[PDB]
């Protein structure tokens, strides 16, 4: 699907590099943008989102955005959207209203003829909105910008079952067969939803978060990362979730913080969404001025993986004890490039951890 | 050693008629090291 076509596009543009973004967050950003688009410009965006009804589309995100806004004391989620428009650009009331009402996103007039100043204005705003989690969103603001759309999201939730911080120990990580790095490796022998995809040749483990959200870690077999990436799809994801079986594993997972920052105007065109980023963009919904286009569409996703979990993670199960031999434990070590998904009802995050 | 079979060899297979008599013990009139303890537990 679109989410996976984008993933591959990003990985292709930056080989052997960490890739990390929020599929649902970008979909929201695009849906929001479609509010001010028209003609073919709008069509490309909708086709990209693979879209029932527009009213339904926006309603869904509005609600979804409301839910993710409910401070569920077990998660740390900061999702935001904002448009910065050059001072000279006249904004349409209908568009500004729809953005605030449907996507809780504000529009801010900005003097782009003063890069440094505008860049600080934007970064400062994002930092404020993300409580300091997402700072320095922009690193180089091209002069003469017209409209800059920013989409940011931070996430950090407690695992259903904790990782003994006394079990976390720094280990070797093979970015490549030749390049090795030391990384804090968390660990815990226990039962996990596990699956061995022989088709794509990768091992998939599910580690649930406190709630209905779960993290999926995929370790391709030697030299099969590219093969797994090409196989990534909605169908494949659905499959994994369905073929999962509880298995006793001696799991070794790196403790880390991963982030991804992207200039979507540089990649989306190759995926079919191009007009909105050109001078022939039909953004009549946003402004009645003719030289209106999305100069930059920045997306930044940051997720932190630690040991913190709901319970002490141990014992329990049954009063009686089996007298059969203990379950055989399999070793699963994520010490080389792996893929990661964070899913609820939607794909919250998707990426490749090339270097923790 | 009196024993009345309960199963049908057609479905059970062979061996029931001579069940529980060990080749290296009962069949050789030899006792294992602790079976006396079991027999003594029946005294009351």
């Amino acid at each position: 699907d679109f989410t996976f076509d984008l993933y591959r596009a990003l990985a292709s543009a930056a080989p052997s590099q960490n890739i990390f973004f929020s599929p649902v967050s970008i979909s929201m950003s695009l849906a929001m943008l479609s509010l001010g688009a028209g003609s073919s410009t709008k069509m490309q965006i909708l086709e990209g989102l693979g879209l029932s009804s527009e009213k339904e589309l926006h309603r869904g995100f509005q609600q979804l955005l409301q839910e993710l806004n409910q401070p569920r004391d077990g998660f740390q989620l900061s999702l935001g959207n904002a448009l910065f428009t050059d001072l000279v650009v006249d904004l349409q009331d209908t568009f500004v209203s729809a953005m605030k009402t449907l996507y809780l996103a504000d529009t801010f007039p900005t003097n782009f003829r003063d890069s440094a100043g505008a860049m600080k204005q934007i970064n400062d705003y994002v930092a404020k909105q993300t409580k300091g989690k997402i700072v320095d969103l922009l690193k180089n603001l091209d002069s003469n910008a017209v409209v800059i759309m920013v989409n940011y999201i931070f996430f950090k939730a407690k695992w259903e079952t904790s990782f003994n911080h006394k079990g976390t120990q720094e280990q070797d990580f093979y970015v490549t067969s030749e390049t090795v790095v030391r990384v804090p490796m968390m660990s815990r022998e226990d039962q996990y939803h596990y699956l061995l995809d022989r088709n794509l040749s990768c091992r998939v483990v599910g580690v649930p978060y406190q709630g209905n959200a779960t993290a999926l870690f995929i370790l391709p077999s030697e030299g099969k990362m590219q093969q797994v990436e090409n196989g990534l799809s909605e169908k494949t994801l659905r499959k994994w979730l369905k073929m999962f079986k509880k298995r006793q594993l001696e799991l070794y997972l790196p403790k880390f913080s991963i982030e991804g920052s992207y200039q979507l105007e540089k990649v989306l065109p190759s995926l079919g969404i191009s007009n909105v980023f050109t001078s022939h963009a039909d953004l009549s919904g946003i402004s009645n001025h003719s030289n209106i286009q999305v100069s930059e569409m920045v997306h930044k996703a940051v997720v932190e993986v630690d040991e913190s979990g709901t319970r002490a993670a141990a014992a329990t199960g049954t009063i009686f004890t089996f007298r059969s031999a203990r379950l055989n434990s399999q070793r699963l070590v994520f010490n080389r490039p792996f893929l990661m998904f964070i899913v609820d009802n939607n794909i919250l995050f998707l990426g490749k951890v090339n270097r923790p | 050693s009196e024993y009345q079979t309960f199963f049908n060899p057609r479905t059970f297979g062979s061996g029931e008629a001579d069940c529980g008599l060990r080749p290296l013990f009962e069949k050789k009139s030899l006792e294992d090291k602790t079976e006396r303890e079991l027999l003594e537990s029946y005294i009351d």
């Binding site: 039962q191 079986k245 509880k246 298995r247 006793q248 199960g317 009063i319 009686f320 004890t321 089996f322 007298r323 059969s324 031999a325 203990r326 379950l327 055989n328 | 050693s1 009196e2 024993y3 009345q4 309960f6 199963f7 049908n8 057609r10 479905t11 059970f12 297979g13 062979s14 061996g15 029931e16 001579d18 069940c19 529980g20 008599l21 060990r22 080749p23 290296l24 013990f25 009962e26 294992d32 090291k33 602790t34 079976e35 303890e37 079991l38 027999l39 537990s41 029946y42 009351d44």
Partner: protein, 253 residues
């Protein structure tokens, strides 16, 4: 087996070792009741919460063994399984009630000085032998202590059957008539119990009426091993004999 001793050669010719495969390792104990049928515990094979579901293709059985690790040429026999049958009402959700499973050998095993079936009890023998105070015998290659401590050869321990009221008061688990418990009381001065790896093995008793060994129970669950004031529990073989008969009649030929 905790606080047991080394078995003598051919002392338990009905002893069966149950294995899992790839990797292959000891899974449980079991017992030979004919040249085509083997008895074991249901919890050795199935437990939904852990996605444990060992089928014929995941298992193998070794018969006639003494050593836990050494292959015994011209003595031990390896038999694949044709099919496995677990009691349909095996209560894995609560107390492991009806913890029993039958396994049919892919090919009949030849008897020898080391391989010979044990008897299953008739009503009179069960009534006569399964009584509080009388001692039975448990065998297995399971751990020697609750807390790798594994035996070099088959272990054996003789244990007294315990009165049902005492068994009931010893645990919070609901005990049923398809279970009995055995072991020494704190004041009896002796110890012994089955443990991890012994499940599925036989609890046998020697009949003084015909000099034959009868399997009265199957090593089932417990709470730890050889703990003070606790007792090991066993599947009551006679009470499930009708089920055994039914399964054999339907799938034995």
């Amino acid at each position: 087996i905790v606080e047991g001793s080394d078995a003598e050669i051919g002392m338990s010719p009905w002893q069966v070792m149950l294995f899992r495969k790839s990797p292959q390792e000891l899974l449980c104990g079991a017992s030979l009741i004919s040249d085509r049928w083997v008895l074991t515990a249901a919890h050795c094979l199935l437990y939904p919460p852990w996605d444990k579901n060992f089928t014929e293709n995941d298992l193998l059985v070794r018969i006639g063994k003494h050593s836990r690790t050494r292959y015994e040429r011209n003595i031990e026999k390896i038999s694949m399984l044709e099919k496995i049958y677990i009691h349909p009402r095996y209560n894995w959700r609560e107390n492991l009630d009806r913890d029993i499973a039958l396994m049919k050998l892919k090919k009949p095993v030849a008897f020898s000085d080391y391989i010979h079936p044990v008897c299953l009890p008739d009503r009179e023998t069960a009534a006569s032998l399964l009584q509080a105070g009388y001692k039975g015998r448990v065998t297995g290659w399971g751990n020697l202590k609750e807390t790798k401590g594994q035996p070099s050869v088959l272990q054996v321990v003789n244990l007294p059957i315990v009165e049902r009221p005492v068994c009931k008061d010893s645990t919070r688990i609901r005990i049923t008539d398809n279970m009995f418990c055995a072991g020494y009381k704190p004041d009896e001065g002796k110890r012994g119990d089955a443990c991890e790896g012994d499940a599925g093995g036989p609890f046998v008793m020697k009949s003084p009426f015909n000099n034959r060994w009868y399997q009265m129970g199957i090593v089932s669950w417990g709470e730890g091993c050889d703990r003070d004031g606790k007792y090991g529990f066993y599947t009551h073989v006679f009470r499930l004999k009708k089920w055994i008969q039914k399964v054999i009649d339907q799938f034995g030929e």
